[PDB]
Amino acid sequence: PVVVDIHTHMYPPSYIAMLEKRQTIPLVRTFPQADEPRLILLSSELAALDAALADPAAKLPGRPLSTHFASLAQKMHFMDTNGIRVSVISLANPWFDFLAPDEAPGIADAVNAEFSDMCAQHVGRLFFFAALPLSAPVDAVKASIERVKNLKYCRGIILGTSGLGKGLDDPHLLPVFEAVADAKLLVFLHPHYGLPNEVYGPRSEEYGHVLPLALGFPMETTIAVARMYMAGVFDHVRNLQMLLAHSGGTLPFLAGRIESCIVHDGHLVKTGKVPKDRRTIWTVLKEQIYLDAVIYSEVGLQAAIASSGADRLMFGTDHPFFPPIEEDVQGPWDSSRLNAQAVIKAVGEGSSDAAAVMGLNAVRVLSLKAELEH
Amino acid sequence: PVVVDIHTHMYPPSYIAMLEKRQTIPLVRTFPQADEPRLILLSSELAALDAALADPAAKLPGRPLSTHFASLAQKMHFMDTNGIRVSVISLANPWFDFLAPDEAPGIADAVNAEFSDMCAQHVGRLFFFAALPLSAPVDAVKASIERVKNLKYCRGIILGTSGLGKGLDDPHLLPVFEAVADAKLLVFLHPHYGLPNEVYGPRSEEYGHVLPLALGFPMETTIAVARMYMAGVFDHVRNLQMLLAHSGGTLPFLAGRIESCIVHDGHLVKTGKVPKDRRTIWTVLKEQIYLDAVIYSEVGLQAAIASSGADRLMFGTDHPFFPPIEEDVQGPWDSSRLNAQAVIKAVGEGSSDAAAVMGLNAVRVLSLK
Ligand SMILES: O=c1[nH]cc([N+](=O)[O-])c(=O)[nH]1
Numbered sequence: 125p126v127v128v129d130i131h132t133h134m135y136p137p138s139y140i141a142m143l144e145k146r147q148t149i150p151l152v153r154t155f156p157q158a159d160e161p162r163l164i165l166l167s168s169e170l171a172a173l174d175a176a177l178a179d180p181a182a183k184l185p186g187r188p189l190s191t192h193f194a195s196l197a198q199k200m201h202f203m204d205t206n207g208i209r210v211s212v213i214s215l216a217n218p219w220f221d222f223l224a225p226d227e228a229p230g231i232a233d234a235v236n237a238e239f240s241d242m243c244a245q246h247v248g249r250l251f252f253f254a255a256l257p258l259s260a261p262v263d264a265v266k267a268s269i270e271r272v273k274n275l276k277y278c279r280g281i282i283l284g285t286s287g288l289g290k291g292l293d294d295p296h297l298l299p300v301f302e303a304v305a306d307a308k309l310l311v312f313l314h315p316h317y318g319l320p321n322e323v324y325g326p327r328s329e330e331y332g333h334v335l336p337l338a339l340g341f342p343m344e345t346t347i348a349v350a351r352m353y354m355a356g357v358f359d360h361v362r363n364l365q366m367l368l369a370h371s372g373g374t375l376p377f378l379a380g381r382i383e384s385c386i387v388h389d390g391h392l393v394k395t396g397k398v399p400k401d402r403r404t405i406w407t408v409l410k411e412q413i414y415l416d417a418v419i420y421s422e423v424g425l426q427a428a429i430a431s432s433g434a435d436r437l438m439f440g441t442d443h444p445f446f447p448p449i450e451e452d453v454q455g456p457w458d459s460s461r462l463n464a465q466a467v468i469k470a471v472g473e474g475s476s477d478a479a480a481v482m483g484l485n486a487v488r489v490l491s492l493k494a495e496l497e498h
Numbered sequence: 499p500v501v502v503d504i505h506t507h508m509y510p511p512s513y514i515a516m517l518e519k520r521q522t523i524p525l526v527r528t529f530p531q532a533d534e535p536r537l538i539l540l541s542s543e544l545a546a547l548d549a550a551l552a553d554p555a556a557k558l559p560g561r562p563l564s565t566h567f568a569s570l571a572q573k574m575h576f577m578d579t580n581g582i583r584v585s586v587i588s589l590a591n592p593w594f595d596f597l598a599p600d601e602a603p604g605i606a607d608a609v610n611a612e613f614s615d616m617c618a619q620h621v622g623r624l625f626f627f628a629a630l631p632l633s634a635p636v637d638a639v640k641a642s643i644e645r646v647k648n649l650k651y652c653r654g655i656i657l658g659t660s661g662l663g664k665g666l667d668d669p670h671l672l673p674v675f676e677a678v679a680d681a682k683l684l685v686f687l688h689p690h691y692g693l694p695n696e697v698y699g700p701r702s703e704e705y706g707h708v709l710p711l712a713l714g715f716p717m718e719t720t721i722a723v724a725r726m727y728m729a730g731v732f733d734h735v736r737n738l739q740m741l742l743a744h745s746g747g748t749l750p751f752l753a754g755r756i757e758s759c760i761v762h763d764g765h766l767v768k769t770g771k772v773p774k775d776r777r778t779i780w781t782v783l784k785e786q787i788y789l790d791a792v793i794y795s796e797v798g799l800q801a802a803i804a805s806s807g808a809d810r811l812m813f814g815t816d817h818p819f820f821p822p823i824e825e826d827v828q829g830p831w832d833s834s835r836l837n838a839q840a841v842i843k844a845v846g847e848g849s850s851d852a853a854a855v856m857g858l859n860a861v862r863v864l865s866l867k
């Protein structure tokens with residue numbers, strides 16, 4: 125059975141170029157003491173950057189911009205060294221969110237074209253999720269969607285939680301969901317914005333990136349999806365299919381609570397927002413939601429499997445965001461092996477469920493099969 | 499076997515008195531169209547209050563202050579109708595967090611004494627978690643701890659996530675954790691502050707209380723516990739035992755991700771913050787954390803069980819915050835039955851795991867004799 129990674133990232137060199145030229149987050153900066161440039165993507169990193177600029181003694185801000193971000197050759201090496209046959213690559217956060225409305229469509233088109241060309245270098249081993257110019261008017265977004273569906277190797281759209289600027293329950297976003305669903309493109313929902321920094325308290329900088337990455341990211345995903353659900357997006361766009369990063373963030377754990385809070389909400393019940401034929405979040409989890417297996421534990425994974433089914437879980441690695449700190453960065457990756465281990469521990473090595481999660485679900489759902497049998 | 503509810507609240511009548519004397523949240527107010535007063539506790543309800551104070555046409559703010567909040571008779575009725583033999587009651591959010599430092603210790607002392615008296619009305623059926631005057635100096639907080647440990651029927655402490663005002667990873671809070679743990683009092687950690695309201699976006703009003711209650715609360719709990727763990731609180735206070743509201747919020751689901759982010763953090767590894775003998779979050783989950791079973795689904799519950807063990811899970815109802823909306827409020831509560839059903843579905847009816855979770859864990863852990 126073929127192993128497929130559906131959660132794996134790149135920044136093309138032209139995108140990195142943009143980041144090096146930016147004055148505010150997201151940006152890339154080189155420091156005299158460091159031997160790699162710094163990638164600075166998050167609001168949480170803002171303080172450490174200010175300190176690093178004002179003081180040469182202070183710690184390096186953000187994270188290392190390793191060669192893995194831009195190197196297709198290293199992406200292929202990672203895949204070989206980690207037993208991965210196919211990658212569905214996506215542009216990383218924050219995609220095109222920071223671009224001015226006028227420039228966005230042109231840049232998105234160029235970058236999506238680059239990804240198609242990247243995939244063409246290793247026929248059958250590479251596919252991609254395209255990113256959209258969501259800062260531009262909805263009509264430009266629609267035209268951008270039509271273009272990417274006709275790009276070789278494109279198998280979906282990656283997007284963040286901000287939508288057009290008002291989140292995913294913004295009714296102006298509905299025709300974007302419709303256009304993507306009608307094009308039969310899987311929507312890969314991915315965090316970036318996290319939670320306002322104050323929630324982590326005055327000692328947050330002591331804990332590294334642990335709180336914003338381990339908590340802020342999955343919580344953002346849950347809030348965005350819950351907002352979509354409450355707004356009736358899944359009912360208004362019935363053919364919409366979504367892949368959720370990090371096994372839905374926390375959704376599989378909180379689904380029962382969300383359901384209880386809905387049926388016990390006085391305001392919602394008495395204004396008719398809780399009818400009897402209402403499609404529950406459980407139904408949506410089985411019908412319109414796919415979950416990645418980037419969850420690192422058989423505990424989380426089992427919850428995800430119970431929520432969506434073994435045929436709706438897809439292995440990912442989140443390469444290259446979590447490199448080994450003390451081992452060879454070109455050898456096997458712990459962050460990848462933990463997720464594979466979680467699969468084996470949860471459903472058994474060599475089982476049909478193991479084969480499904482590890483690649484066959486992605487092969488089926490993302491129509492990679494005709495390309496694999498060639 | 500005995501059914502124990504460890505997650506169940508009351509406001510004593512005098513506490514309600516303070517609430518309609520308050521000009522800012524938390525507050526109680528009566529509105530023309532419903533003689534049942536409105537309980538307004540949360541930052542999320544602030545907008546709907548301002549709308550209702552200006553326009554007599556806008557929706558009633560907060561939630562109904564039913565008789566189930568202040569009446570001990572109603573508490574016992576709820577218990578009898580829902581098959582609950584024992585309740586470990588606690589003062590509900592926001593406890594004493596809003597009180598001035600000078601008035602706090604005296605008020606806590608009075609309220610904690612009331613709770614002890616209420617428990618005495620139904621011997622063997624009622625115990626309580628005591629609340630602390632955390633807006634007061636640490637010394638007054640320690641004095642309150644020594645007092646509540648000698649109150650009949652007290653079995654632990656309930657506390658929120660703000661601590662002294664800077665969260666639970668505040669070093670000044672370390673002596674409080676030490677005193678509580680040395681007194682062999684279980685700490686029940688409970689949400690209130692949730693998340694800054696902007697995260698719910700501009701349509702939040704349309705979804706009722708769903709986002710702040712279903713998401714904000716358990717996420718607040720997760721962040722607070724994670725901060726405690728990262729600051730080494732559990733290693734500094736090895737005898738500390740904590741009960742986490744709503745099955746740890748989201749902790750059982752994110753524990754794997756937390757571990758991964760720690761061992762892959764460059765700054766932490768390079769500054770010696772990830773030694774090899776390090777106690778993992780899994781270890782702490784098995785040794786110093788108990789989880790309530792207020793999770794509403796066998797899916798969540800199974801993750802909690804896998805995280806802490808079946809011997810560290812405890813049934814709760816969250817009475818009286820989720821009454822039936824169209825069913826008889828004097829009948830069985832769905833919000834309680836959903837959690838009982840989740841136990842049955844996860845471990846099987848009549849099993850020893852079932853009996854443990856439904857009450858025997860609480861009996862053992864909290865010495866309910
Ligand atoms: O900056 C980032 N941090 C973390 C992740 N990730 O874990 O999905 C990511 O994709 N991007």
Ligand SMILES: O=c1[nH]cc([N+](=O)[O-])c(=O)[nH]1
Nearest residue numbers: 539590591711743816819
């Ligand atoms: O105001 C509140 N809303 C909800 C809960 N609860 O469900 O834990 C609570 O304890 N207090």
Ligand SMILES: [Zn+2]
Nearest residue numbers: 131133314442
């Ligand atoms: Zn990612």
Ligand SMILES: [Zn+2]
Nearest residue numbers: 505507688816
């Ligand atoms: Zn509660």
